Amino acid sequence: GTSKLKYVLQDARFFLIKSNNHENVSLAKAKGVWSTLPVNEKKLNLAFRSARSVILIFSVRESGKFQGFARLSSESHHGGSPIHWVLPMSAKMLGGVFKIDWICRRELPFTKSAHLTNPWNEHKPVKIGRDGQEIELECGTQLCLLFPPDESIDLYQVIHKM
Ligand SMILES: CNC(=O)c1n[nH]c2ccccc12
């Protein structure tokens, strides 16, 4: 069902993550981590302390789809087991590492979210956005509910964290 998802998403904040390649979304799905540029990592760290949940929604560029979404379970931190991200630029330019819990690892095509606009990007369709763009509450919730259920995920332990 979708009740515990709705509960997780309640009063959440959402941010559009854009990846240049599939390999980085695969590493994120395998290791439960994300790293970004410091201008974005600064935005996420502030959002993490302010919201019950901070939801990242991933799209690989030129893929035409979102690849799922995840919930931040920490602020960024430095000095961890390094992550072999594929970069255009290398290594140091990325800030710290965020720990994330995946809520949906399935894909959603842009064609299915064309009725959702994002007021914080001039009401352009929610698929339109720079890496790190915030998605307003109502658009962001409805977008997450469009994803096919990911039956391999149990939101009980995610709820145990907020
Ligand atoms: C795993 N994180 C990234 O691949 C990433 N995040 N922000 C960026 C900006 C330019 C290029 C790559 C990135």
Swiss-Prot record:
Q: What are the subcellular locations of this protein?
A: Nucleus; Nucleus speckle
The domain of life is: Eukaryota
Report the outcome of F58D.
Does not affect ability to influence alternative splice site selection
Cite the effect that the entry attributes to N24D: Abolished binding to N6-methyladenosine (m6A)-containing RNAs
Q: Which residues cross the membrane?
A: none
Q: What is known of its domains?
A: The YTH domain mediates RNA-binding.
- Protein name stated in the entry: YTH domain-containing protein 1
Source organism: Homo sapiens (Human)
